[PDB]
Amino acid sequence: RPDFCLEPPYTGPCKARIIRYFYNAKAGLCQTFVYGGCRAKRNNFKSAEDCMRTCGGA
């Protein structure tokens, strides 16, 4: 898995409430978080499937 998978999720400075997924490495799963709409980091997925394929070995 990419090292960016191990970074905490990043909401950013924009003020949307967009539900995105991030990989929680210890939990071995993709979890939801609030993304503000700009300046996304890479541990930020539009679906659980995208997240698991990229960071969960799917």
């Binding site: 400075p13 003020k15 949307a16 409430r17 967009i18 539900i19 503000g36 709409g37 700009c38 300046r39």
Partner: protein
């Protein structure tokens, strides 16, 4: 909205909720078939929900209208956040009544010290999560350019302005973006960004709607 109050005591009929299976941004009804929102709220399909107070309960005044066209400002900058504005054309005309009606475009720029009404379904907490079912309201003043710049050195473009309190405590927050800042019956701002929410010396930053009136009118005319 952090530090505000339930809008049930107010009339906010121009507020819309943008929905993609859940509420993700606000917007403002400016014409029977057009909504203004933030460019960072762009999604390729959006359902506009009008007439809402409680976004979790059908109350009987809702109109749910899908977008026909979604037009982000062509010079939107995803790093600097310049030109953070978008227009949504509704697939059918909103029915205008006490619960759903338009807000006037501004005829002159934001004025320092003017009290404005900011509203939305965003987070009501500055740490953690406290998202409301019912629309929240905040009365806050336009701040001077000097204060806006001192708060965010080098990051404020000519299309941005600050509204709020340098002492923090009351601000717009995640979930509010795209929604209205109304000053004396005119739409002056679109909720945009900030350094967190309600932090000391970090008031919210808002798109200056007045800087876009010709773009809005031209876009509506070209897509009618």
């Amino acid at each position: 909205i952090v530090g505000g109050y339930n809008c049930e005591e107010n009339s906010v009929p121009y507020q819309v909720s943008l929905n993609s299976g859940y509420h993700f941004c606000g917007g403002s009804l400016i014409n029977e078939q057009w909504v203004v929102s933030a460019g960072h709220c762009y999604k390729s399909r959006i359902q506009v929900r009008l007439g809402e107070h409680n976004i979790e309960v059908l109350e009987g005044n809702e109109q749910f209208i899908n977008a026909a066209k979604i037009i982000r400002h062509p010079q939107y900058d995803r790093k600097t956040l310049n030109n953070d504005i978008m227009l949504i054309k509704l697939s059918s005309r909103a029915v205008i009544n006490a619960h759903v009606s338009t807000i006037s475009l501004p005829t002159a720029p934001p004025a320092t010290g003017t009290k404005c009404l900011i509203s939305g379904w965003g987070n009501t907490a500055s740490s953690g999560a406290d998202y409301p079912d019912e629309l929240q309201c905040l009365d806050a003043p336009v701040l001077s350019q000097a204060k806006c710049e001192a708060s965010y050195p080098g990051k404020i473009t000519s299309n941005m302005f600050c509204v709020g309190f340098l002492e923090g405590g009351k601000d717009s927050c995640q979930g509010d973006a795209g929604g209205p800042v109304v000053c004396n019956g005119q739409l002056q701002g679109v909720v945009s960004w900030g350094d967190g929410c309600a932090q000391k010396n970090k008031p919210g930053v808002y798109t200056k709607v007045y800087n876009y009136v010709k773009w809005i009118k031209n876009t509506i005319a070209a897509n009618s």
